[PDB]
């Protein structure tokens, strides 16, 4: 990369991180979607 | 309705083979509890054998019970020769499984299964 540098981008990591597994910086998976079914919210006023 | 048999000509020879397979299992159960060092009693294993024979008691087809006798001889052969481990013998006893809901109301409470 000193002779032929990589083509720069605004989104490439300027700080390369090594393998973070076993550290508190490790990856934890999760569902990246929102909630599908919406529940009914009962009225906060009395019914009499 | 004229079919080729497996071993039995009618249900009497079929019940004879069922009965001899039951004799072989009944004799084998104490040896199985000993050499697999199972934590069940001999009576508990013999009750399991009686359960596995009464589960198929509704069958009136000689070919179907001939295949049940053949598969029972195969299971017995896997038991006597130590081909099963302790785990394969104890899979007849569904011991880690929680008891299933039986009546309507508990099946209603747990979920959607009929």
């Amino acid at each position: 990369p000193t002779v032929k540098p990589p083509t720069a981008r605004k989104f490439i990591w300027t700080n390369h991180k090594f393998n973070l597994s076993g550290t508190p910086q490790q990856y934890v998976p999760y569902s990246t979607t929102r909630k599908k079914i919406q529940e009914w919210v009962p009225p906060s006023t009395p019914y009499k | 309705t004229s079919v080729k048999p497996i071993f039995s000509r009618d249900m009497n020879e079929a019940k004879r083979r069922v009965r001899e397979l039951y004799r072989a299992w009944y004799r084998e159960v104490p040896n199985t509890v000993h050499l697999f060092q199972l934590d069940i009693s001999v009576k508990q294993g013999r009750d399991k054998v009686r359960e596995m024979f009464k589960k198929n008691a509704h069958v009136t087809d000689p070919r179907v019970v001939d295949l049940l006798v053949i598969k029972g001889k195969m299971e017995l052969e896997e038991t006597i020769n130590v081909w099963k481990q302790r785990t394969h013998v104890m899979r007849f006893f569904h011991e880690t499984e929680a008891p299933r809901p039986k009546d309507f109301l508990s099946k209603f409470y747990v979920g959607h299964d009929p």
Binding site: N19, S21, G22 | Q85, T87, H88
Partner: protein, 156 residues
């Protein structure tokens, strides 16, 4: 304190001897055995890390589960695991040992060896290369390097 320094240095000593003398028992289940045989081949050479080639399962220190675990062999895997002396470690090599892999939805495949044995290092690939498996072995060595058996024993 003084005893905290002593248990720190003794942890460093015993972790050095345990990570620098790993003895693997490799389950040659499937295609991952070929790539473990390349991790023992001259290019990568596990033996220069103190990682011997094919220790017996009763003197080995780590069990490399290299291949597909089926339902017919899972009690044999658990038997060999129970017969290992402690400290014993488990490297899961390849997708079938990790999570079932290409045979995940099969009727006869244990969906990952972690349903059977506790796994320390999950090495991903189909197969992971001999360089990637050697990476997983060195990550296991780094995991042993930060063990605190005597420090936690001193603090209990």
């Amino acid at each position: 304190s003084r005893g905290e320094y002593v248990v720190a240095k003794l942890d460093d000593l015993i972790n050095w001897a345990r990570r620098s003398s790993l003895w693997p028992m490799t389950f040659g289940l499937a295609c991952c055995a070929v790539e473990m045989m390349h991790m023992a081949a001259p290019r990568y050479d596990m033996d220069r890390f103190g990682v011997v080639f094919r220790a017996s399962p009763r003197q080995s220190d780590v069990m490399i589960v290299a291949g597909t675990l089926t339902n017919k062999m899972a009690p044999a895997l658990r038997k060999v695991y129970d017969q290992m002396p402690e400290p014993r470690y488990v490297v899961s090599m390849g997708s079938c040992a990790n999570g079932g892999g290409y045979y995940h939805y099969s009727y006869s495949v244990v969906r990952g060896c972690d349903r059977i044995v506790p796994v320390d290092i999950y090495v991903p690939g189909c197969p992971p290369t001999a360089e990637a498996l050697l990476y997983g072995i060195l990550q296991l060595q780094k995991k042993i390097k930060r063990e605190k058996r005597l420090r936690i024993w001193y603090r209990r």
